[PDB]
Amino acid sequence: NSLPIPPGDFGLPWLGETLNFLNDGDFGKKRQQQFGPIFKTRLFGKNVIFISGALANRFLFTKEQETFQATWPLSTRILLGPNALATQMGEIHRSRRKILYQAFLPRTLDSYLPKMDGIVQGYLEQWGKANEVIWYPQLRRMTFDVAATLFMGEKVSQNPQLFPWFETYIQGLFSLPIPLPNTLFGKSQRARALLLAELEKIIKARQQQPPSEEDALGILLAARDDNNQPLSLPELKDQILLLLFAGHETLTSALSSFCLLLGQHSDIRERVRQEQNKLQLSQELTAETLKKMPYLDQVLQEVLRLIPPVGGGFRELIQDCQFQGFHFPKGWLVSYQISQTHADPDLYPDPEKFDPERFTPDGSATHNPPFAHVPFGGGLRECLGKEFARLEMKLFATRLIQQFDWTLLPGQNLELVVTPSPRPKDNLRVKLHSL
Ligand code: HEM
Ligand SMILES: CC1=C(/C=C/C(C)=C/C=C/C(C)=C/C(=O)O)C(C)(C)CCC1
């Protein structure tokens, strides 16, 4: 069939519009205005079509196996490793998906709580003592601490080079894949080498011990493929590195967003508080207690809606396709943009406004088309850790609101940069007031 390809500029050979993608907060919106709802570009040497909205998301998460193959930018793939779920395909992917899910079972999450709440309260106490808190970097310390603790173990967490290395590793994930020591990418390459060497040490320690499936690392050590074979060491290291990155980076964004938004909407903050008051907290807080928070549930859906931690995903077309009148050529990439979908005014009337009532029983977002709220993606690659994320968001939201009000200091830049997750430019300057 003789259909046109989408409008859009490819730019220079290979380089294309990669620099705009990596540096402009404007990328998708600029090309939507200039080119329309479906546009093409070139990124990291690949021709890419950007799509968004319920129907485009439906398309991308339908008859997927025969059409769409998950991928990531060249820098991301190299730094994740060939043995990570994010970089696995087909039968291997299906298998590790079932293996990893066991780390996030309803009851295993329930068992994460005590250590998680202990790490959470520890930080709140410190921040409550301070005058001004520059919050964003603090949230990064905390979320790493929770992830290292719950996925690996407590003595692992107090060990002191791990965080600095991860921070450097993260900075190169979405960058120019230039393998020199004076680039963000080469520094992340070196960070990855140092981290794997440590995780290898951490793994060899755990193997000379009675089998425990308390955490993610123990779960992976116990895991067997369909041919009853263990995961290799290189796979073990790539898999924990991913879980620690995802558990750390995404949650840093979600919680700064929550602190940002409930910072600016003190009425919503009070309704959350009113909810946790019709219960009975103390320090006594169980997994079944957090399941009694329907209104907080709504706020957290809406935080993720307004400021999605993960901007989008990428797929290679392995079949030739068409969508809304365009040829989607075999071997080109498609990118689904969660940020664009969540800013659709048809899906989200007054998209710029923070309104939890969209997720209230009969609200606008409840009878939207499928694939309208996609903070965790959908189809075959839908976030595997979503309930770990929701757990940590709910506990943090709960402990923070029960103990403190807070003020976002006047004259700061609250504007959001994405390297590679939304963060406020001036790192969220606050004062907490104890209750
Ligand atoms: C609110 C926080 C989070 C958000 C918004 C989020 C978002 C996403 C999205 C959009 C995808 C799909 C990307 C694609 O289409 O390929 C994904 C996949 C994934 N997520 Fe999450 N994520 C979050 C937290 C977590 C956590 C806490 C973990 C566990 C440590 C995690 C682990 C993963 C993994 C391993 C994948 C790859 C799945 C696959 O390739 O099949 N994420 N996530
Ligand atoms: C790599 C990777 C992850 C992080 C994705 C991020 C942080 C990308 C943001 C997308 C952007 C920045 C796209 C755009 O703007 O178009 C998650 C946690 C899902 C785990 C699977 C592998």
CA of 402 from ligand 2 middle (Å) equals 32
Beta-carbon contacts of residue 432 (< 8 Å; ≥ 6 apart): 124, 127, 128, 130, 133, 404, 405, 406
CA of 132 from ligand 1 middle (Å) equals 33
Q: Is 383 annotated as a binding residue?
A: yes
Please tell me if the CB atom of residue 334 comes closer than 6 angstroms to any atom of ligand 2. Answer: no
**Ligand 1 atom closest to residue 97's alpha carbon, by position in its atom list:** 41
Please tell me if the CB atom of residue 388 comes closer than 6 angstroms to any atom of ligand 2. Answer: no
How many Cβ atoms sit within 10 Å of the Cβ of residue 426? 15
- Of 79, 413, 49, residue with least CA distance to 249: 79
174 close to 73: Cβ distance less than 8 angstroms: yes
Amino acid at 14: W
Q: Return d(Cα 48, Cα 382) in angstroms, integer.
A: 21
Question: Is residue 36 packed enough to be buried (19+ CB in 10 Å), middle (13-18) or exposed (0-12)?
Answer: exposed
Q: Return d(Cα 272, Cα 298) in angstroms, integer.
A: 10
Q: Which CATH architecture has domain 1-435?
A: Orthogonal Bundle (1.10)
Residue 67, Ramachandran bin (φ over 0: left; ψ between -120 and 50: alpha; else beta): alpha
- Of 162, 188, 166, 163, residue with least CA distance to 177: 188
- Of 42, 44, 25, residue with least CA distance to 176: 44
Q: Where are the domains of the chain?
A: 1-435
Beta-carbon contacts of residue 31 (< 8 Å; ≥ 6 apart): 8, 39, 41, 50
| Nearest ligand (C-alpha, residue 25) | 2
Q: What is the 3-state secondary structure (H, E, C) of the chain?
A: CCCCCCCCCCCECCCECHHHHHHCCCHHHHHHHHHCCCEEEEECCEEEEEECCHHHHHHHCCCCCCCEEEECCHHHHHHHCCCCHHHCCHHHHHHHHHHHHHHHCHHHHHHHHHHHHHHHHHHHHHHHHCCEEEHHHHHHHHHHHHHHHHHCCHHHHCCCCHHHHHHHHHHHHCCCCCCCCCCHHHHHHHHHHHHHHHHHHHHHHHHCCCCCCCCHHHHHHHCECCCCCECCHHHHHHHHHHHHHHHHHHHHHHHHHHHHHHHHCHHHHHHHHHHHHCCCCCCCCCHHHHCCCHHHHHHHHHHHHHCCCCCEEEEEECCCEEECCEEECCCCEEEEEHHHHCCCCCCCCCCCCCCHHHCCCCCCCCCCCCCCCCCCCCHHHCCCCHHHHHHHHHHHHHHHHHHEEEEECCCCCCCEEECCCEEECCCCEEEEEEC
CA of 270 from ligand 1 middle (Å) equals 30
Amino acid at 120: V
CA of 87 from ligand 2 middle (Å) equals 13
Strand partners, 18: none
Q: Return d(Cα 40, Cα 297) in angstroms, integer.
A: 37
How many Cβ atoms sit within 10 Å of the Cβ of residue 291? 11
Elucidation technique? X-ray
398 close to 296: Cβ distance less than 8 angstroms: yes
* Four-residue CA torsion sign, 271, 276, 277, 282: negative
CA of 298 from ligand 2 middle (Å) equals 24
Q: Which CA distances in Å does 140 have to 136, 143, 150, 165, 298? A: 6, 5, 16, 13, 24
| Nearest ligand (C-alpha, residue 339) | 2
Q: CA neighbours within 13 Å on the CB side: how many for 200?
A: 9
- Of 291, 313, 297, residue with least CA distance to 258: 297
172 close to 75: Cβ distance less than 8 angstroms: yes
Which one of 18, 31, 252, 310 would you pick to mutate in the ligand 2 pocket, going by the greatest count of ligand atoms within 8 A of its CB? 310
Which one of 109, 166, 250 would you pick to mutate in the ligand 1 pocket, going by the greatest count of ligand atoms within 8 A of its CB? 250
| Nearest ligand (C-alpha, residue 385) | 1
Strands 333-337 and 46-51: parallel
**Ligand 1 atom closest to residue 151's alpha carbon, by position in its atom list:** 30
Q: Which CA distances in Å does 301 have to 36, 305, 366? A: 28, 6, 11
Please tell me if the CB atom of residue 251 comes closer than 6 angstroms to any atom of ligand 2. Answer: no
- Of 128, 115, 206, 189, residue with least CA distance to 154: 115
Q: Return d(Cα 396, Cα 294) in angstroms, integer.
A: 16
Angstrom resolution of this structure: 2.1
Neighbour-count burial for 231-248, b at 16+ CB within 10 Å, e otherwise = beeebbbbbbbbbbbbbb
